[PDB]
Amino acid sequence: RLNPGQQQAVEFVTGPCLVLAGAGSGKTRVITNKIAHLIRGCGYQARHIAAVTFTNKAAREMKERVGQTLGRKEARGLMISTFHTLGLDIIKREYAALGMKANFSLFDDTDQLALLKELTEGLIEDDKVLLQQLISTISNWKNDLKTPSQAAASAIGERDRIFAHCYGLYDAHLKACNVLDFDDLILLPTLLLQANEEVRKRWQNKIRYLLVDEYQDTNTSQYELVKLLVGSRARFTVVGDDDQSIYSWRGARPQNLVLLSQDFPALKVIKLEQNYRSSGRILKAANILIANNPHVFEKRLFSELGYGAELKVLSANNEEHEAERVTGELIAHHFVNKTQYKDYAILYRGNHQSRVFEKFLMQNRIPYKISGGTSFFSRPEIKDLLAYLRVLTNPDDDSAFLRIVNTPKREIGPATLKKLGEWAMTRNKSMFTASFDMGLSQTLSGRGYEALTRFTHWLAEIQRLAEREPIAAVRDLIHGMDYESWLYETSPSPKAAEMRMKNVNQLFSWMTEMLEGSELDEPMTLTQVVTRFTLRDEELDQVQLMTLHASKGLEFPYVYMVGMEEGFLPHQSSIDEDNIDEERRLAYVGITRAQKELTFTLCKERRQYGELVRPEPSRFLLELPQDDLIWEQ
Amino acid sequence: RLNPGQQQAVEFVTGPCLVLAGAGSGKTRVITNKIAHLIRGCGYQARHIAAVTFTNKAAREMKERVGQTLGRKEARGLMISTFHTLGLDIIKREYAALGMKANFSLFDDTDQLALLKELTEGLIEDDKVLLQQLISTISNWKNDLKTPSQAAASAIGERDRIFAHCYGLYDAHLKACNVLDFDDLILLPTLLLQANEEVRKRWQNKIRYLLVDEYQDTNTSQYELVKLLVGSRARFTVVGDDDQSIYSWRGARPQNLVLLSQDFPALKVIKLEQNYRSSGRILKAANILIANNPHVFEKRLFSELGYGAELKVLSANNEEHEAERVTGELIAHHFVNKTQYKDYAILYRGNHQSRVFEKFLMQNRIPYKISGGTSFFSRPEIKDLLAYLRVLTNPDDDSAFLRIVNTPKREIGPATLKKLGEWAMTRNKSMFTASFDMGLSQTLSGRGYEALTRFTHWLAEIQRLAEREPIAAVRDLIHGMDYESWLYETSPSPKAAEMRMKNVNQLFSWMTEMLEGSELDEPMTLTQVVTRFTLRDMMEREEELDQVQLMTLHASKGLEFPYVYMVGMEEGFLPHQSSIDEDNIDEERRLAYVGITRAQKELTFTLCKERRQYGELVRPEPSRFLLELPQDDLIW
DNA sequence: TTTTTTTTTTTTTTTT
C-alpha cells in the first residue's frame, strides 16, 4: 500500500511534477503505479504515456511490473524505453514521415574509440585512459550542442586544443561515412524537433504524459529533448535525488533538479522520505554524512526497520591486509550467521582495489562477481597461463591442451591437431598423452608431428620437474615459450603487453606464495594451487564485488566499503579541485546501499611509488555520527 | 496465330460477354486487340468505346499498346480510364450540362484518415490498424450504397455500432464542407445516373461499347455503375478470374463473375486457359491447390513451357534463419546461374516479415526494392505544393487553404484563422474568399489581418496570373514563399531537404509537360493537371533497377518473376488467423494461388520453425496449403 | 578515478 508521499506523488497528475525519492523509497513502485493510475483513473490511454529511463534494464524491469499490474490489454503501447531507444525511434519515425528513411548503424562505443585510434595515431598516444578522455570529452562538447570549431573556441589547454581538432575529424568522418555515435541519437531529434513545429506537436500529442526516472543523471540534450517533448502543457513527472548525482563527469547536470525548478516554476516537488531497506542506524549516518554537503532541497530519510548494528571501521595495515581482513571477516560472518555469498557486497572507488580481493576471495574458494569490471581470472594472458598449469596438473584435460597447443605460438596446424585428436579419440585418451603413442606417428607425420613432439616434450619434461620444483618448473614454463615476447607481438600497444605481462607475474607470484605456504597457512600442492585458481572458469550465490559507481541503485544486506582513505574515497584528483561534494554523494550512495550492517575499511599505509605513505581516514568517516561508529585498533 | 480462346474473345462483339482469363492467359493483348478490332473490323468508332480499369497504370499501359496499333487519330481520342477517372468525369461533365460549379474536394485517403482521427478521438483508440478498419469498413457501407443510418441497422457488434456512428460523423462532415472521398466518385454518378433518364441515355450513347478489366475486383457501386452504363444492349466484355479475387475485404464482390451470370441473360463466358509463363510444374501445383476451393466456374491453367524444377520447401528454425537461408540461397542461385536480383522475388502475407529480409539482403550488399512505400503523392513537401495548386485552381477549397495559410510560414495565428472561419462561416463562403470581405476587417484586425491579407492577396495575384502563364505562376508560387528554404529549415538532415526539394521539382515538371501537352495526349489546363495529381496519376514514365523484388502477396497481383521465394509458409501467417478463425480461407487460398502463379521458372516455399510472436514463442505447423500441393513435385 | 547508450515486432492486405 502507498505511504503518503508515494501516494501524493501518485495522485498529482495535473502538472509539471518532481518526485524527490530519497534512497530505497521505492520509486519504481510509484512510477508504475503512477502509470497504472494515469490510465485507470484519468482515462489517459496507455499509448499516450511515455516512461523514460536510462538503462535497458530499468527499462525491462519497469515494463515487467507495469504489465504485472496493468492488464495485458490496457497496458498496450507504453513508451517505456531508454532515452536512446526513443531518441533513435524519433529519428527513425520522423524520417519515415517525409516518406524517407534512415540507415546508419549507431557507432557502438568501441567502433568509436576504434575509429578514434586510427583518427589520432601520431596526434595522440596509443593509450586507453587517454582515448577515453578524448571520447568522453568529445561526447561532452556534443552534449553542449556545439560544433568541432565552436569547441576550439571553448578550448583551453594543449592536448585540449588537440582534442578539439581531433574532435573536428571525428564528426568529420561520421557526418561523412553516414553514422552516428550514441549521444547523437539524442541531439538528433532534439534539434529536428526544435527546428520544426510540424513534427514537434505530433510528438507533443503522442507523448501526452511523460514520466522520467533517474533524473539526477539527465544531461543537457536529454533535458532539452524532454522539454521539447512537453514544453508548457508540462503534464509529467520527473523523478530523482540530487544526492545521488554521481555521473557528473559524464554530462549529468547536477543542478538538474534546480534548473528544472527555473524553466518550470509551477513545479510541485513531492518528496519521498520513507526508506524500506536500511536500518535506522545506517540511514542516520547517511543522513548526516550528506548534510555536510551544501544543501538545497532538505531531505531527511527514515525507515520503519530496526536500528541496526554499529558501523564498524576496520583499520588495515596495508593494501593486502585489508583484503585479508575483509575476506576473513566476510567468511566468519557468513559461517556464523548461515547467510548467502550474495548477501555480501564489497565496494571501492577505483577498479584496482579489486585485484587484491579477487585474490583472497578466490584464494579462499569464495565465489564472487566483478560487476564493476572484468575478473582478473578471465584476462586471456591469465586464461592461457592457467591452462598450461591445468595441463601440467592434469594431462587428461584436452580442453587446456587444445587451447595451449599452439597458442603460445608453435606451428601445430589444425590438421596435425585434428589428426592427433582423431587418433587420440579412437585410441581413447587425451591429446597430449596420445601425442606420444608410436601408432599416431603415421596417421599424421610431416612437419606437424615435428612440432607436436617437440612441444608435447617440452611440456612433459617440465611437468616432470614441477613434481618437486613447481616454482622452477612454472618459472621455466614461463620464459620457456617466451610468452613475454608472444604477448608483445599479440598485444596491441606495448604498454598493454607490458600490463598483460605484469598480470602474468602477479598470477605466478600468487601461485608461489601459496606453494610456499606460510606461518599459519600450511603450503599447497601445485594441484590444489591450481584447482583454487581454476574454479572461476544469474541464479548463483556469490559476493557482489564492484565499484561504488557500479553499485548505484542496488542493495545488499551487508556491505564493506573498503579503502576509506583520503586520497582514495575523497579521490585525490577531486581532493585537489575543491569539488568533493560529489565524492561525498558517492560515499552517501555507497552507504545507503547497505541494508542490515555496514563496515568501513582503510589501509594504514599505501605504496606511493616505492615510497610508502601513511594516509588519513576519508574525512567522510569523521563527519559520520561517532556514537554509532566503532573504530577498531 | 493468337490462341483460339483469345481469338474468340476478340471476335465475340455482339452482346454480354465475359472472358475468364486464367493466370497467364494474355488479358492485355485480347483487350487491346478487341478494341482495335471493334473499331477496324466492327466499324465501332474509336470515340464510342470505353475500356475501364482499376489502376491509373494498366490504363496508361493499355492506352500505350492500343495507341500503337492505331494512330492518335483513333487512338488518343478513345475512352480508356480508371473507374474513378470516369466516375469523376461523369460528375464533372453532367455538372456542366447542369452548368454548376464543381468545387468539391477530392479527399485523398490520407486527408480522409486524419479527418477521422480528429472526428474520432476519445471515441476510438488512437491507433493506425484501428483507423484502417474504420476507413475501410466505412468505404464499404458506402460501396454497398448504404446510409450512415441504414448501416447502424446492418451493424452487429460494439466497436461496429460505434463505427456506424463515427461513419455518421464522417459522411456528416463531408456532405457539409463539400468534399468527397474517392468512393463518392463512383457512388455519385451511379445515383445521378439511375435517378435521371436524360443523362443515362446520353452516356448509354457515349459508351456504345465497354470493356472492363480485372472484373473480379469490381465492388458494388462499380458493378452497378457498369450496369447503368451498359443498360440494355449489353454490348460489352468484362474480363477476369474469380480465382484471383483477393481484395474482397475492401468491397470486392468475389461472386461478381456469378452475379453477372444472372442480371444478364445471354452472358457468354469465353475462357482463356493457356498459360505462357510458368512451368508446367508450377501451373500443376497451382492448378491443384486452387481446386480445394469450391467452384462454380471450371477451368485449369496449363502452359506449353517445359515442366520445371521441383518446388522446394525450405524449413527454417527461427524468424531470422529464414531470411538467412533465403538471402543465402538467393546469392548462390544468382552466382552460379547469373540472373539479376530482379529475376528474384520474395513474397510475404504481411509487412513485418519484410523486417528481417531487408537486413540480410542489405547485410550482403544485395540491392532490392520494398513492396509498397508511401506514394509520392503523400510526401508532405508534395501535398503542401499540391494544396496551393488546389486553392489556386479552386478558391473554394478551405481544406486546402486551411493547410497552406501558415504552413509555408507567414504569421497567421489560429486566432486570426478562427475568426476568418467564423466570418467566412456566417457569410457562407471560402476562407480565402472571405479573406476579402470588407466586413471581416472588424471581426478581426491587428497583425493577423495584416498577415492574412498580405498572403491571400499574393495568392490572388498568382491566381490571376496563372490564368495566362500556368507554369510561370506556379514557378513564382514556389520561389515566392521560398519553399526551398522552408524545407531546409523544416527538414531533418539537409540532404532530406534537398530530396524533399527534388520531389518538389519533379512534381513541377510533370505538371509542366502535362500542361505543355503530349503528342499522344492533348494538352491540359492547369485545373485538370491538378485533378490528375489529385487521382495520383503520377504518370510513372528503359534502365530498370536490377535488384531484389521484395513484396507482399497482394503486391504480386499480375506480375511475373522467374524465381520466387514465397516466405513464411506457416499456418498462422499465410493462411492468416483472421481468416483461419473466420470460416473463410478460400480467400487466403486465392492469395497463395496467386503468389504461386507469379513465378515462372522456379518456386520455393519457406516456413519459420519458431515464432517471435507473444514476446515468447510457438512451434507452428506448415500452411495447410503447402500440403494440398502435389507432393510429387514438392521437396523438403 | 568513475562508464550506460541498440534499426523491430507493435502482432493482416491498401487502387483510388
Coordinates of N, CA and C in Angstrom, one line a residue, chain A residues 470-620:
Chain A
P470 N 57.9 -27.0 -8.4 CA 56.8 -26.4 -9.1 C 57.3 -25.1 -9.6
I471 N 57.5 -24.2 -8.7 CA 58.0 -22.8 -8.9 C 58.9 -22.8 -10.1
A472 N 60.1 -23.5 -10.0 CA 61.1 -23.6 -11.0 C 60.4 -24.0 -12.3
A473 N 59.8 -25.1 -12.2 CA 59.1 -25.6 -13.4 C 58.2 -24.5 -14.0
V474 N 57.3 -23.9 -13.2 CA 56.4 -22.9 -13.8 C 57.3 -21.8 -14.3
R475 N 58.2 -21.3 -13.5 CA 59.2 -20.3 -13.9 C 59.8 -20.6 -15.3
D476 N 60.1 -21.8 -15.5 CA 60.7 -22.3 -16.7 C 59.6 -22.4 -17.8
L477 N 58.4 -22.8 -17.4 CA 57.3 -22.9 -18.3 C 57.0 -21.5 -18.9
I478 N 57.3 -20.5 -18.1 CA 57.2 -19.1 -18.5 C 58.2 -18.6 -19.5
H479 N 59.4 -18.4 -19.1 CA 60.4 -18.0 -20.1 C 60.6 -19.0 -21.2
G480 N 60.2 -20.2 -21.0 CA 60.3 -21.2 -22.0 C 59.7 -20.9 -23.3
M481 N 58.4 -20.7 -23.4 CA 57.7 -20.3 -24.6 C 57.8 -18.8 -24.9
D482 N 58.5 -18.1 -24.0 CA 58.7 -16.6 -24.1 C 57.4 -15.9 -24.3
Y483 N 56.4 -16.2 -23.5 CA 55.0 -15.7 -23.5 C 55.2 -14.2 -23.6
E484 N 56.2 -13.7 -22.9 CA 56.5 -12.3 -22.8 C 56.6 -11.7 -24.2
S485 N 57.5 -12.3 -25.0 CA 57.6 -11.8 -26.4 C 56.3 -12.0 -27.1
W486 N 55.7 -13.2 -27.0 CA 54.5 -13.5 -27.6 C 53.5 -12.4 -27.3
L487 N 53.3 -12.1 -26.1 CA 52.3 -11.0 -25.7 C 52.7 -9.8 -26.5
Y488 N 53.9 -9.3 -26.3 CA 54.3 -8.1 -27.0 C 54.0 -8.1 -28.5
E489 N 54.0 -9.3 -29.1 CA 53.7 -9.4 -30.5 C 52.2 -9.4 -30.8
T490 N 51.4 -10.1 -29.9 CA 50.0 -10.2 -29.9 C 49.2 -9.0 -29.3
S491 N 49.7 -8.5 -28.2 CA 49.0 -7.4 -27.6 C 49.1 -6.1 -28.5
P492 N 48.1 -5.3 -28.4 CA 48.0 -4.0 -29.2 C 49.2 -3.1 -28.9
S493 N 49.0 -2.0 -28.1 CA 50.0 -1.1 -27.7 C 51.0 -1.9 -26.7
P494 N 52.3 -1.7 -26.8 CA 53.2 -2.5 -25.9 C 52.7 -2.4 -24.4
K495 N 52.4 -1.2 -24.0 CA 52.0 -0.9 -22.6 C 51.0 -1.9 -22.2
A496 N 50.2 -2.4 -23.1 CA 49.2 -3.4 -22.8 C 49.9 -4.7 -22.7
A497 N 50.8 -5.0 -23.6 CA 51.6 -6.2 -23.4 C 52.3 -6.2 -22.1
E498 N 52.8 -5.0 -21.7 CA 53.6 -4.8 -20.5 C 52.7 -5.2 -19.4
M499 N 51.4 -4.6 -19.3 CA 50.5 -4.9 -18.3 C 50.1 -6.4 -18.4
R500 N 49.7 -6.8 -19.6 CA 49.3 -8.2 -19.9 C 50.3 -9.2 -19.3
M501 N 51.5 -8.7 -19.2 CA 52.6 -9.5 -18.7 C 52.6 -9.3 -17.2
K502 N 52.6 -8.1 -16.7 CA 52.5 -7.7 -15.3 C 51.5 -8.7 -14.7
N503 N 50.4 -8.9 -15.3 CA 49.4 -9.8 -14.8 C 50.0 -11.2 -14.6
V504 N 50.6 -11.7 -15.6 CA 51.2 -13.0 -15.6 C 52.2 -13.1 -14.5
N505 N 53.0 -12.1 -14.1 CA 53.8 -12.3 -13.0 C 52.9 -12.5 -11.8
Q506 N 52.1 -11.5 -11.6 CA 51.1 -11.5 -10.5 C 50.6 -12.8 -10.2
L507 N 50.0 -13.5 -11.2 CA 49.4 -14.8 -11.1 C 50.4 -15.7 -10.4
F508 N 51.6 -15.8 -11.1 CA 52.7 -16.6 -10.7 C 53.0 -16.3 -9.2
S509 N 53.3 -15.1 -8.9 CA 53.7 -14.8 -7.6 C 52.6 -15.3 -6.6
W510 N 51.4 -15.1 -7.0 CA 50.3 -15.6 -6.1 C 50.5 -17.0 -5.9
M511 N 50.4 -17.7 -7.1 CA 50.6 -19.2 -7.1 C 51.8 -19.5 -6.2
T512 N 52.8 -18.7 -6.2 CA 54.0 -19.0 -5.5 C 53.8 -19.0 -4.0
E513 N 53.4 -17.8 -3.5 CA 53.1 -17.6 -2.1 C 52.4 -18.8 -1.5
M514 N 51.4 -19.3 -2.3 CA 50.6 -20.4 -2.0 C 51.3 -21.7 -1.8
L515 N 52.3 -21.9 -2.8 CA 53.1 -23.1 -2.8 C 54.1 -23.0 -1.7
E516 N 54.5 -21.8 -1.4 CA 55.4 -21.5 -0.4 C 54.7 -21.8 0.9
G517 N 53.4 -21.5 1.0 CA 52.7 -21.7 2.2 C 53.1 -20.5 3.1
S518 N 52.7 -20.6 4.4 CA 53.1 -19.6 5.3 C 53.0 -20.1 6.7
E519 N 53.4 -19.2 7.7 CA 53.3 -19.4 9.1 C 52.1 -20.2 9.6
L520 N 50.9 -19.8 9.1 CA 49.7 -20.4 9.5 C 49.0 -21.2 8.4
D521 N 49.3 -20.8 7.2 CA 48.8 -21.5 6.1 C 49.7 -22.5 5.6
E522 N 49.4 -23.8 5.9 CA 50.2 -24.9 5.5 C 50.2 -24.9 4.0
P523 N 51.4 -25.0 3.3 CA 51.6 -25.0 1.9 C 50.7 -25.9 1.0
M524 N 50.6 -25.6 -0.2 CA 49.8 -26.3 -1.1 C 50.5 -27.0 -2.3
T525 N 50.0 -28.2 -2.6 CA 50.5 -29.0 -3.7 C 50.1 -28.1 -4.9
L526 N 50.9 -28.2 -6.0 CA 50.6 -27.4 -7.2 C 49.2 -27.7 -7.7
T527 N 48.8 -29.0 -7.5 CA 47.5 -29.4 -8.0 C 46.4 -28.6 -7.3
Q528 N 46.5 -28.4 -6.0 CA 45.5 -27.6 -5.3 C 45.6 -26.1 -5.7
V529 N 46.8 -25.6 -5.6 CA 47.1 -24.2 -6.0 C 46.4 -24.0 -7.4
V530 N 46.4 -25.0 -8.2 CA 45.7 -24.9 -9.5 C 44.2 -24.8 -9.3
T531 N 43.6 -25.9 -8.8 CA 42.2 -26.0 -8.6 C 41.6 -24.7 -8.0
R532 N 42.3 -24.2 -7.1 CA 41.9 -22.9 -6.5 C 41.8 -22.0 -7.7
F533 N 42.9 -21.6 -8.3 CA 42.7 -20.7 -9.5 C 41.5 -21.1 -10.4
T534 N 41.5 -22.4 -10.9 CA 40.5 -22.9 -11.8 C 39.0 -22.7 -11.6
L535 N 38.5 -23.0 -10.4 CA 37.1 -22.9 -10.1 C 36.3 -21.7 -10.8
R536 N 37.0 -20.6 -10.9 CA 36.5 -19.4 -11.6 C 35.9 -19.8 -13.0
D537 N 36.8 -20.3 -13.8 CA 36.5 -20.8 -15.2 C 35.3 -21.8 -15.2
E538 N 21.3 -14.5 -13.6 CA 22.3 -15.4 -12.9 C 21.5 -15.9 -11.7
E539 N 21.6 -17.3 -11.5 CA 21.0 -17.9 -10.3 C 22.1 -18.5 -9.4
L540 N 23.1 -17.7 -9.2 CA 24.3 -18.1 -8.4 C 24.6 -17.2 -7.2
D541 N 25.0 -17.9 -6.1 CA 25.4 -17.3 -4.8 C 26.8 -16.8 -5.0
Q542 N 27.0 -15.6 -4.8 CA 28.4 -15.0 -4.9 C 28.4 -13.6 -4.5
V543 N 29.5 -13.2 -3.8 CA 29.8 -11.9 -3.3 C 29.9 -10.8 -4.3
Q544 N 29.0 -9.8 -4.2 CA 29.0 -8.8 -5.2 C 30.2 -7.9 -4.9
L545 N 31.0 -7.8 -5.9 CA 32.3 -7.1 -5.7 C 32.4 -6.0 -6.8
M546 N 32.2 -4.8 -6.6 CA 32.2 -3.7 -7.6 C 32.5 -2.4 -7.0
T547 N 32.5 -1.4 -7.9 CA 32.8 0.0 -7.5 C 31.6 0.6 -7.0
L548 N 31.8 1.7 -6.3 CA 30.6 2.4 -5.8 C 29.8 2.7 -7.0
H549 N 30.4 3.3 -8.0 CA 29.6 3.6 -9.2 C 28.8 2.5 -9.7
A550 N 29.5 1.3 -9.7 CA 28.9 0.1 -10.2 C 27.6 -0.1 -9.4
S551 N 27.7 0.2 -8.1 CA 26.6 -0.1 -7.2 C 25.4 0.7 -7.2
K552 N 25.5 1.9 -7.8 CA 24.3 2.8 -7.9 C 23.0 2.1 -8.1
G553 N 22.1 2.4 -7.2 CA 20.8 1.7 -7.3 C 20.6 0.3 -7.0
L554 N 21.5 -0.2 -6.1 CA 21.4 -1.6 -5.7 C 21.4 -1.7 -4.2
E555 N 21.3 -2.9 -3.7 CA 21.3 -3.1 -2.3 C 21.7 -4.5 -1.9
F556 N 22.3 -4.5 -0.7 CA 22.7 -5.8 -0.2 C 22.7 -5.7 1.3
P557 N 22.4 -6.8 2.0 CA 22.4 -6.9 3.4 C 23.6 -6.5 4.1
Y558 N 24.8 -6.8 3.5 CA 26.0 -6.5 4.2 C 27.0 -5.9 3.2
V559 N 27.5 -4.7 3.5 CA 28.5 -4.0 2.7 C 29.8 -3.8 3.4
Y560 N 30.9 -3.8 2.7 CA 32.2 -3.5 3.2 C 32.7 -2.4 2.3
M561 N 32.5 -1.2 2.7 CA 33.1 -0.2 1.8 C 34.5 -0.1 2.2
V562 N 35.4 -0.6 1.3 CA 36.8 -0.6 1.6 C 37.6 0.6 1.1
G563 N 38.8 0.6 1.6 CA 39.6 1.7 1.2 C 39.0 3.1 1.4
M564 N 38.8 3.4 2.7 CA 38.2 4.7 3.1 C 39.2 5.7 3.5
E565 N 40.3 5.8 2.7 CA 41.4 6.7 3.0 C 41.1 8.0 2.3
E566 N 41.9 9.0 2.5 CA 41.7 10.3 1.9 C 41.9 10.2 0.5
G567 N 43.1 10.2 0.0 CA 43.4 10.1 -1.4 C 42.3 9.3 -2.2
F568 N 42.0 8.1 -1.7 CA 41.1 7.2 -2.4 C 39.6 7.6 -2.5
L569 N 38.9 7.5 -1.4 CA 37.5 7.9 -1.5 C 37.5 9.3 -1.8
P570 N 37.8 10.2 -0.8 CA 37.9 11.6 -1.4 C 39.1 11.4 -2.4
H571 N 38.7 11.2 -3.6 CA 39.7 10.9 -4.7 C 40.6 12.1 -4.9
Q572 N 41.9 11.9 -4.7 CA 42.9 12.9 -4.8 C 42.6 13.8 -5.8
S573 N 42.5 13.3 -7.1 CA 42.1 14.2 -8.2 C 41.1 15.2 -7.7
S574 N 39.9 14.8 -7.3 CA 38.9 15.7 -6.8 C 39.4 16.4 -5.5
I575 N 40.1 15.7 -4.7 CA 40.6 16.3 -3.4 C 41.1 17.6 -3.9
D576 N 42.0 17.6 -4.8 CA 42.6 18.9 -5.4 C 41.9 19.4 -6.6
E577 N 40.7 20.0 -6.4 CA 39.9 20.6 -7.4 C 38.7 21.2 -6.7
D578 N 38.7 21.0 -5.4 CA 37.8 21.5 -4.4 C 36.4 21.0 -4.6
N579 N 36.1 20.2 -5.6 CA 34.8 19.5 -5.7 C 35.1 18.3 -4.9
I580 N 34.2 18.1 -3.9 CA 34.3 16.9 -3.1 C 32.8 16.6 -3.0
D581 N 32.0 17.6 -2.9 CA 30.6 17.4 -2.8 C 30.1 16.1 -3.5
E582 N 30.7 15.9 -4.7 CA 30.3 14.7 -5.4 C 30.8 13.4 -4.7
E583 N 32.1 13.4 -4.4 CA 32.7 12.3 -3.8 C 31.8 12.0 -2.6
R584 N 31.4 13.1 -1.9 CA 30.6 12.9 -0.8 C 29.4 12.1 -1.2
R585 N 28.7 12.6 -2.3 CA 27.5 11.9 -2.8 C 27.8 10.5 -3.0
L586 N 28.9 10.3 -3.7 CA 29.4 9.0 -4.0 C 29.4 8.1 -2.7
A587 N 30.0 8.5 -1.6 CA 30.0 7.8 -0.3 C 28.6 7.5 0.1
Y588 N 27.9 8.6 0.3 CA 26.5 8.5 0.8 C 25.7 7.6 0.0
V589 N 26.0 7.4 -1.3 CA 25.3 6.4 -2.1 C 25.8 5.2 -1.4
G590 N 27.0 4.8 -1.7 CA 27.6 3.6 -1.1 C 26.9 3.2 0.1
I591 N 27.0 4.1 1.1 CA 26.3 3.9 2.4 C 24.9 3.5 2.3
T592 N 24.1 4.3 1.6 CA 22.6 3.9 1.5 C 22.3 2.6 0.7
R593 N 23.4 1.9 0.3 CA 23.2 0.7 -0.4 C 23.1 -0.6 0.5
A594 N 23.7 -0.4 1.7 CA 23.7 -1.5 2.6 C 22.4 -1.4 3.4
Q595 N 21.9 -2.6 3.7 CA 20.6 -2.6 4.4 C 20.6 -3.2 5.9
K596 N 21.5 -4.1 6.2 CA 21.5 -4.7 7.6 C 22.7 -4.3 8.4
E597 N 23.9 -4.3 7.8 CA 25.1 -3.9 8.5 C 26.1 -3.4 7.5
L598 N 26.9 -2.4 8.0 CA 27.9 -1.7 7.1 C 29.2 -1.6 7.8
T599 N 30.3 -1.9 7.0 CA 31.6 -1.8 7.6 C 32.6 -1.1 6.7
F600 N 33.2 -0.1 7.3 CA 34.2 0.7 6.5 C 35.6 0.1 6.7
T601 N 36.5 0.3 5.8 CA 37.9 -0.1 6.0 C 38.9 0.8 5.3
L602 N 40.0 0.9 5.9 CA 41.0 1.8 5.3 C 42.4 1.2 5.5
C603 N 43.4 1.5 4.6 CA 44.7 0.9 4.7 C 45.5 1.9 5.5
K604 N 46.2 1.5 6.5 CA 47.0 2.4 7.3 C 48.2 2.8 6.5
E605 N 48.5 2.1 5.4 CA 49.7 2.6 4.6 C 49.6 2.1 3.2
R606 N 50.0 3.0 2.3 CA 50.0 2.8 0.9 C 51.3 3.0 0.3
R607 N 51.6 2.3 -0.9 CA 52.9 2.4 -1.5 C 52.7 3.5 -2.6
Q608 N 53.2 4.7 -2.2 CA 53.1 5.9 -3.2 C 53.8 5.5 -4.4
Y609 N 55.1 5.3 -4.4 CA 55.8 4.9 -5.6 C 57.1 4.3 -5.0
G610 N 56.9 3.1 -4.4 CA 58.0 2.6 -3.7 C 58.1 3.4 -2.4
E611 N 57.6 4.6 -2.5 CA 57.6 5.5 -1.4 C 56.4 5.1 -0.6
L612 N 56.5 4.7 0.6 CA 55.3 4.4 1.4 C 54.7 5.6 2.1
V613 N 53.4 5.7 2.0 CA 52.6 6.8 2.6 C 51.6 6.4 3.7
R614 N 51.5 7.1 4.8 CA 50.6 6.9 5.9 C 49.4 7.9 5.7
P615 N 48.3 7.4 4.9 CA 47.1 8.1 4.6 C 46.2 8.4 5.8
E616 N 45.4 9.3 5.6 CA 44.4 9.7 6.6 C 43.0 9.3 6.2
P617 N 42.3 8.8 7.2 CA 40.9 8.4 7.1 C 40.0 9.3 6.3
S618 N 39.3 8.8 5.3 CA 38.4 9.6 4.5 C 37.7 10.5 5.4
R619 N 37.9 11.8 5.3 CA 37.2 12.7 6.2 C 35.8 12.3 6.4
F620 N 35.2 11.7 5.4 CA 33.9 11.2 5.5 C 33.6 10.4 6.8

